[PDB]
Subunit: 340 residues, 6 copies
């Protein structure tokens, strides 16, 4: 957990995040060309960052956002496929792991159901070791089929990695779920458009803190014909403190070293802000002093999670009373999204 | 949701938070004296803040932290009791609601089990309308009996209020639970000691954003013989933007107006960052476009919450593998907290 | 007055500001081409921002700065004209209002007097509803004919709008004049070049506060052969707090919702910082308590404004004693600007 | 215009501002005692700040705020009087000029009309050289009789000084009026209570910039039984950049050197942001190039100032349409302030 | 190198810094009383910070600044002496190391030469393991005899510690000298008075970075009759990033864990910003590629250091040409300091 | 020392720094083309900045970084040469001085030894008045032959200028060496790649403060195939306060006026933070009061500098014990850099 050098050591994973300029693309040929630009970029970056072990690209960095439905379907990728092979070769050549974005990935029922929005983790031998499908697509504007699972994978030097996408990160639950599965680094890849710049910068830091996890964020930049993306790719410590952070600049890069031994030492020996431990051992001191055992309390005391787990339809109904009953709102209509 | 005036209108609740200097007290008489100081403060503040509808004091503002066990037991309060009556009279006189701290509140089995750490919400008629017992005590150093429930109460002008305490706020789950019950304001009362100053400032803002809720934070200041408390009491909008924030100064005050109609308009008509709505309607656009209904997906896709709810002992075991198996650590021992 | 969503409601106006990359243009054909780029941008942005009601472009976004006098004269626009029609069509297609820049607009005595520097407000039916000519051109370098009037126009959802340009905003008087005419939003369009970046960011916020008005700022970006423009387009609340702010990035966008009912509620019920009210009712409490009526004092107590209004030549003379007597300075000469 | 040393030179005025802890006083004897505390403070400070030429204390630093009317009347000062003599002796002993606050100063019709809220500038020989009565009292809560005039006085080393008070500074007009009279330093003395902390920090800087003037701000700190005062006393350059700024700490001090020759060189040779010059020579380049003389335009183009000057009752009526017609509001009533 | 917990592990040293309120004292008895207050504070702090291994107090925290010469001489301490014994007992009781300030420490020729300004490092057995005498007293106002040596001592858990005082830290040379002797933590104890607040906050961070060293800063707070001290005690990583930082509050505390293994891993394996290594191996890549050996260049290429080392009188003369020839300046005279 | 205008006066030097987009070049023809782009830029900038006296470009702005050895050798420049003539003509035409970068400059033994990394200062008559060869190349990645000397040259209006390059600035020694030679402005030209953005922003400010010198920094921007450069070109006062600072934007510009008389007045009359004076007159007050002369102490009390000067091999050995013995590290190998 240290910032400012280009090296890495046996204890540190060298992580690079990229403020990748958002592509504005329309065909499969243009996607492949851009995929090769990304590959070239990986290779060049390793020349300057000899400590690089992990390189992270934004959601949508490969295809851009395919606003047109037909083009979306025409350019949806197979995993493994040609794009991923192009990425894998860069990872082998530069001897790094990498996180790349396929937007879309063909649905099992392609072309009759919406593509997933997917991330892969590729190791330094070119192997896909994690494929993550976004669980919370950025509705209403974006139309991806939602995925249903998080994953933890052993990464460079044994660092445990989970991947999440853009909108996912607004939801504390996903960051929790990954850390509780053992994630030591949560990588948030995004094409996070203005407006919500300061809110997203803060969310990543707060989530690093709340889940005692390293966080790496690669966000897109530039204007793509619809959205302007605000950059601020960052790597953040498990103590909530930013390691390094980009600005809004096109193809900015940040690079930081995250210590394996430091996070494991913290998760073992931290007390007051060992949040993962403490959530499941509530009031341990109190119970000890009251003659009630030395484990604290594990039971979930939050009715919302309990209802959600046992009766999601009831939890949905409850939330519709507080918000609205239809996915759309007549005060700000959107074609294809129903309201009233 | 507006900052800088001393007024309030029929649409706004005037909220004041206090950077109350932490008391260093030892007897029941000294607690009562301090309670009367708080009452005097409420009355005086209303003279300057004619728009005040809600006044918020820090956790421990009444008793200080009773580090000595015997003194803890001797000064633990009854609710309703003498302290709360002293507070109620100030609320009636100044025609405001208030949030006060009783640390401890006598356990049902007093003096044979540890006191709770409690907050009350008192209305402008002197009535206790919410009593909240802290669910996540600040273990290891602090020895309160944990509570088990959140509450939502109709507050000034109909504003829905939930109370939480200090350490509670590090845990996104509680902020979620309150908002999902309908809370429009979550009041976090704390005696949050250094070191974790920047992390706590950020957490409150991130939680306001993530749960589309007003947040008010009253934190203690000063040095009490053990801890130095970092202030930065604040009121924060439901869009994640700070309204006003104190520094570390003793008996600082902040004051902001939070609009009833604005939060209800937002929760109704917000789309991209309607996080409460969106969590329980995932991928609605995608499902619509894939011919699968217009509600998105409600089902909880996070194995951690599911395991926690169905088998808390398993979730505890899982977390002990990632952290440690005993509440204490031999590398940083604490008397009465077991380790190895 | 809320930030982070892409929606808008019946109570909120959805405002988008653009960090438009400064053009480097030379002919009428190139201006028309760029005008069409702006139009395309409006249409695309509305696809991503369904709540957009008002889109704002920088001063000079259409023509760039025509440094060459001949090119300036050759490209000066008629209002209404071809450029404005191109903008109007985008406003109708995207169903938004827009603020566009014509630099120059032909003088009544074109080509024998310098063009104005002009802004139009175009409604969602394509109609020009306000034409503002800059009152304080950025002398010495820029040679526009000064305009002489501010305007207030009923905008989207009834929101009262005044337009001002760049250098204008350094002068508190203009922001006052607009608010005193009833403006609820002052839109400051600029091609504000480095150096004065932090000063201009602050001025906008201070003016929002001092005049209890929403403020929207669209500033140019990039290097155009002469100047580098610093971006930091922003929307700011009537309480002085930034809603969202761009960085220095080319074609950044910010978007915020400004509440109609909130500003009207504030201007009605604010007391201590109701600056518009208080300026013309000075010392009301004091006069009441002194038995002198319940209106305070309205009379202007500032000799400078009085002299300026009654004898501008005297006020000019006075200022020349404090500064210098000629528009130019021999220590930093500029061709065509006299000194000594 | 330079920060960080304790010295001063023949070109620089050494200015010290004090975050003076707000007194809570009730009698004339207690005022006199506190006045002597201030005197002792001046003398001690000069021991540490050998470059000190000007020392600035907060509004209300002498009396506190006399909330009780009877006590207000009983403690209202004569100028010159006993308090001012106590201050004068400190100024002679420490060989500095000073700015002190008398709240109240007896009205000509004392005790039958409300006291003024007054500031004096005392030179290093003990002489009162400026007496300023606040033009815009902080209504509604504060009940001072409004003054009607600004002043410019030759200060230490010839530096031209104007004094203003607290609420005054929210109004750009007063800062303008002083600078237009020749002020090179505007001293803003305040007991500026929370809430409006960030807004006031920004206002001072913006006013320094807009009026090409040094600004010094001394603000009170602490809690006085009613209000908490936020400190952030500061000295600011004529270019809008802070020299030094206090935090919220009780009896903080800041100290900066402001160059005489630098402001005079700037006001003479600045061009693009010579705001005082440019306001009264609008569009000079344009008029030159259009064959219309080389002075630009002086005429006031802002209808609000013109109406205010010629018909203040009309300007008042106009503003009541935009805000409200009575000084009070039934939604937030205050005893003695009428509404409906 | 991690922030926010109260624990420490076998790899981390738990460092606490104190924003100790500056005493205003006059006699030996009052010094002893205050020394006991400090001791009580250490003991209490350890109760809250079970990970504390090192506690740091400000320069002057024991005596205050003895402005009066006679009182200075009367209260100058012996080391070891009564004060240090009082500190040692607290260190043994709380099982921590500590850094305390003796101002003055008796000169070998006491009372005929000025006292030193001294710091001790006391281990957890009560033993004085380092005594540092300030090399660069804060002339002109402060009159301590200058010391002549830095020291490195093995501290808690083997962490190498050097101590420096206040004004010392403005001079990059001292931070270099300590790190080059092997210091892994440089502790800067100060009573750093306003004005130079932001400059000192930055200096510490820059020095941490430039010398790849942990830095801990304990600075005094409050007003002592002469100076106001600005706090902002901090612990900073060897990568230049702040761990935690106090504000200006009286008796604030910060606490951070600094990893032994992380700094040693960095100093071993860092490349691009291994500043200690690189200073003495300049241009290694270039020399390798030019066929000139694989060590780079060690020779000091800076004529100033060379002249300083070989002929300090010449280096002094040189600097007097650039600044002034006498220690005093007639433009800002100080009694006892000669000028002209 | 003032920010925000485009003018300059007889007392001020108008300095412009450029966030020049890093070139990606391969041949001598492409270098010459880019050199002409820089020239065109200088000329255009002067049109907008009539006060410009000094224009500063980033290290590598002319050639980019020639990563390929053969291309490095093929494009290495002669000084004076064709590139410098192209720059000189721009300086004469725009009547400014300029700082340009030749990377490489041919070694005396070209092409058999690595090129230098060089900066020139060109006066407004086209004359090269300073040629600086980088003393601390950015090893390991960059392979320039190290230079061995700093220089001070009389610049525009007599302002004394020293030039330094990129990595140089991490080392306080060089900034000292220049100031001690009389430098009043140190110009740091850089192509400072991410990661170390915040550290470099801070270093420049800290060095301005520590050496009582103006500092100007021109840093490259953009991505060049290997590195992303973080901009934040800046001009900084001799008091450590930023005048103006760019962001990360391509071809940003900043411009500030630095006063000749202000720095000379400060270096003459500053006392407490006259760091250049004080370093060589330590403890002057103390020695005076102890009867030991009125000059303080000049002798260098830092063993590291003494050893470095007398025995650089010993100082190298010492540092290798603290860091590592070989220029390379087996944990992060780099081809051509030896380790183990
Ligand atoms: Cl999505
Ligand atoms: Cl607790
Ligand atoms: Cl203009
Ligand atoms: Cl008032
Ligand atoms: Cl000293
Ligand atoms: Cl280099």
């Amino acid at each position: 957990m240290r910032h400012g050098d280009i090296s890495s050591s046996h204890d540190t994973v060298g992580i690079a995040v990229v403020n990748y300029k958002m592509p504005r693309l329309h065909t499969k040929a243009e996607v492949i060309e851009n995929a090769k630009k990304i590959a070239d970029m990986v290779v060049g970056m390793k020349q300057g960052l000899p400590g690089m072990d992990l390189v992270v690209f934004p959601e949508y960095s490969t295809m851009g956002i395919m606003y047109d439905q037909d083009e979306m379907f025409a350019t949806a990728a197979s995993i493994p496929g040609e794009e991923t092979a192009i990425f894998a070769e860069a990872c082998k050549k530069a001897d790094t792991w990498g996180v790349f974005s396929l937007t879309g990935e063909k649905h099992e029922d392609h072309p009759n159901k919406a593509p997933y929005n997917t991330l892969v983790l590729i190791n330094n031998k070119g192997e896909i070791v994690q494929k993550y499908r976004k669980i919370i697509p950025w509705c209403p504007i974006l139309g991806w089929y939602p995925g249903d699972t998080t994953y933890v994978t052993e990464g460079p030097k044994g660092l445990k990695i989970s991947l999440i996408v853009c909108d996912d990160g607004n939801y504390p639950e996903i960051w929790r779920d990954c850390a509780m599965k053992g994630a030591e680094l949560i990588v948030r890849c995004q094409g996070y458009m203005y407006p919500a710049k300061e809110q997203q910068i803060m969310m990543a830091k707060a989530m690093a803190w709340a889940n005692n996890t390293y966080v790496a964020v690669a966000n897109a930049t530039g204007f793509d014909g619809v959205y302007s993306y605000f950059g601020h790719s960052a790597i953040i410590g498990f103590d909530g403190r930013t390691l390094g952070e980009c600005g809004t600049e096109e193809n900015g890069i940040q690079y930081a070293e995250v210590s394996i031994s430091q996070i494991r030492d913290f998760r073992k020996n931290a007390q007051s802000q060992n949040h993962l431990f403490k959530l499941l051992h509530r009031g341990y001191t109190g119970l000890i002093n009251s003659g009630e055992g030395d484990r604290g309390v594990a039971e979930c005391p939050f009715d919302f999670y309990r209802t959600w787990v046992l009766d999601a339809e009831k939890a949905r109904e409850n939330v519709e009373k507080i918000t609205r009953s239809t996915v759309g709102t007549a005060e700000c209509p959107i074609q294809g999204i129903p309201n009233e």
